[PDB]
Amino acid sequence: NAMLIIETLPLLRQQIRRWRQEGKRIALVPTMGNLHEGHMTLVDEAKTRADVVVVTIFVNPLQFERPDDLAHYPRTLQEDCEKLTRHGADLVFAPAAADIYPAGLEKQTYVDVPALSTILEGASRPGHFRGVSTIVSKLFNLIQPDVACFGEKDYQQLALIRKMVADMGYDINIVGVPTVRAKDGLALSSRNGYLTEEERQIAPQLSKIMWALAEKMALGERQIDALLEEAAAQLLRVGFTPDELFIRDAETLQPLTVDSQQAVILMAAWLGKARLIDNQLVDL
C-alpha cells in the first residue's frame, strides 16, 4: 500500500485505532527529520519486527534549551519522505509543534528519568533529556507501538528510554540499532558534512582509537583512568581536540562495578567545525 503521511492528531488517532483493532503489530521509529542512511537502517530493522512501521518526523522544541537552535534545525520533509517510502515505512507522522504542545512548553506535563537525565551529556544541558523522555512517552501513548527502534549512535538517549520504559510500565521492545559506518570506520552523522576534505581523512581515527581501547578491555584491562588518558593523547597527536571521555556501565552510565555485565566506551572530539562522537559496547 502507498505510504500514508499524516500531520494531524485526529487523523493519526483514527489510523492507530484501526491497526490496533485489526491486531497489527506496530513498530515506531522516532526521528527529527533530515534523514540519512543511518535512519533508514532503523526503519529496516523495524520492518522485520512488526506488521506496520510508523516513523515520526518532529523537531521537538522541548529538548532544545536554546530556543533559536530550533530555527536552524534542517527541515527536509519531501526528501525524508522519498527515503522512507523506499524503505517501506507505512506511516509518516509529521506534526506541527503547535499541535503537540498547544499549552506551551513551560506548563507541559513532563516525564523525567532521574540520574540518567543529569549526568554526562545531561550535565551541561539542563532540560534536554526531560524533553526527550517527554516526547518519546507522548509518541508511545499516541502510536501504541509494540517495538521501537533507536540508534546506538545517541547512546545516552537509548539508555534513558530503556530506563523510562522499564520504570513506566510500557510493553515495548526497545531495539538499539548499531551505527552505520563508512568503509574506513567513520560513524555516519549529518555532522560529517561539516568536515573539510583534509579533516574527513583524519575523522576515521576516532573509531580506530576507540577500538584499540576496546581490544585492551577484551583481554582484561580495567584501569579506566589510564586508558582514557592514552586515548585523549592519541586523539591530540593525530589532530583532534578531545572532549571528556568515559567508560561506564552500559545500563546506568555510572562507573563500572563488579556486578556490571556490559560496558560502554563514550568518545567525543572536535575536528574543526564538528564535534564528532562514537561509542562501543564491551562484554565484561
Add this chain to the structure above:
Amino acid sequence: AMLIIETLPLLRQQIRRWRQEGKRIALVPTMGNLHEGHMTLVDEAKTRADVVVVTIFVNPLQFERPDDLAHYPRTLQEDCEKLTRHGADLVFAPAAADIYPAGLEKQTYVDVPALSTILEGASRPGHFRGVSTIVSKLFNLIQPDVACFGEKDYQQLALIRKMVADMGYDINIVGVPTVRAKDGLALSSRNGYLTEEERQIAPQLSKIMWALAEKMALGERQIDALLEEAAAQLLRVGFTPDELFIRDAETLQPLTVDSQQAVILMAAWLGKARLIDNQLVDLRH
C-alpha cells in the same frame, strides 16, 4: 468469575487476551480499603465497557508524610470480596517491590506542573507527582478505553485530565460523584483514622461546606469572608482547617465574571485524620 492478579507479566497476559476478544476495558484505580463510593465507581465503569479492571495499590510515591503511609489501611481480602458482588472482572493488586523494584529515589516520574503545586498541591508538596506517576504507569500497563475517578478528589481528577490531554493518552476520563454516609460524611478510607468521638464530629465538615454553598446560592460572593467564617466554624467544633478555597469549577482559577459554576474545596484535620470534601455551586441566576 472475578480474577485476581498480582504480577505485571500475568496482568499483560490477561489484557492481551481481552483485546484479542474485542473487549472494551474500563479502569478504576484505587488504594484499597474499599467502601460504597468505590462500588459506585465500579458500577459506573461497568456501564462504559465490557470488562472492568480495579487496581488496589497503596502508592508510596504519593505519601509525603511517612506516618500516613504507615497507617493507611490494608484490607485486601475484604476488598476483593466486595468487588466480586459488584462484578468487577479483574483486581490487579501488585506489590510495591514490583511496581518500584529499586525503590523511589531513581524512579522515573511524571509531573503535571499546571496543577501539581497549587491548592491541594500546595498543602501536599510532592503528593501529585506520585499520583500522575502511578496513574500513567497503570494506563501504560492496562491501556484502558475509559478510566473512572471519584469527584471527592476534585483536583486529582482535574490533574489526570490535564495529564491525559498533555501526554496523548487515548483514554476517556470519567468523574463519579462523592458517596456519603447517612450523616453526610464523605466516604473515605481515611475516616478509619478517627476515634469514635471524632466520628460524631466529622459530619460537621459537610454541614459547614453546605451552609457556605447556601450563602453563595443566595448571591454571596465575598470569598475570603465566606472562607474565614467556614474556618472559624470548623475550629469551633474541633477541626483544624487546612487552606480552604473557592474556585471556578472548570479551571480551578479564581472566580471571575465569566464563571458559571464554583467549587468549594475543603480540607481539615480531625485528630489524626486529614479530611477533604468539596461542593459544586451553580452561580447562575
